[PDB]
Amino acid sequence: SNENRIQIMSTIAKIYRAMSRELNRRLGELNLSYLDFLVLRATSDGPKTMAYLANRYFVTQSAITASVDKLEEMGLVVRVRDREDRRKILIEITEKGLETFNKGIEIYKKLANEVTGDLSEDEVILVLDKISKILKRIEEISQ
Template identity: 55%
Template sequence: MQKNEDIQIFSSIAKIYRAMQRELNRRFQKLNISYLDFLILKATSEGPTTMVGLSRRFYVTQPAITSAIDRLEKYHLVERKRSAEDRRVIVITITEEGKRTFEEAVKIYTELASEILKDLGEMDDVLMKLNKILEKINEIENK
């Protein structure tokens, strides 16, 4: 019986993630970004990164990252630069406009999280436990 429950839990997590991603894509449209673009802006706001690094970090293909970077560059949200150490490596940095867009996107992201979790206020202890479990799963995945 445990295997069926495990599958059901894993399936629920995947469904929640897809639903959240769809809703964020819808809400981010007014900023001309997608959820993947948001993740790239977040990563570049933490410091310059490579195309390969972004691809590995977000489990997407390099062509998907290239397409996203093309789009972000079109709106002047990120810049591509050649690495000074290795000219074959392309480094992605966020622009000032990208920082402003990212800040707006964080507000949208936070609003959605608040909307979803607002009715669960009386379950704070359960949510804290769930968060610890999800962090543990994430740690296993990132090993």
């Protein structure tokens, strides 16, 4: 019960933010921003409406349109009319977009590996065990 406890939590918070910043930069190698990547992730398992996209990531509708426009011009997704109500527009991922998405996943996995490089396989297991308990408690609380 020391100030070390709040330090663990704010360090975890700092890691999330820094990782997000670094992943965003590395995604630039595929000409994608982190959001562009998230739109591809969301459409990877099926077409989605613009509203679903905006709500899904708590982002403005406009930000979603810009991302889609960029992805469309890059041939990563296409706007298509909803077959059940052709007045609606769905964002559908293309084969290229799907392959670009998978490369984004590889970039993430590589970064995630790199970042824990100073830890041995045993330290990794130990850490995972400890923070998994932290996860369990916060989820029980914030249910």
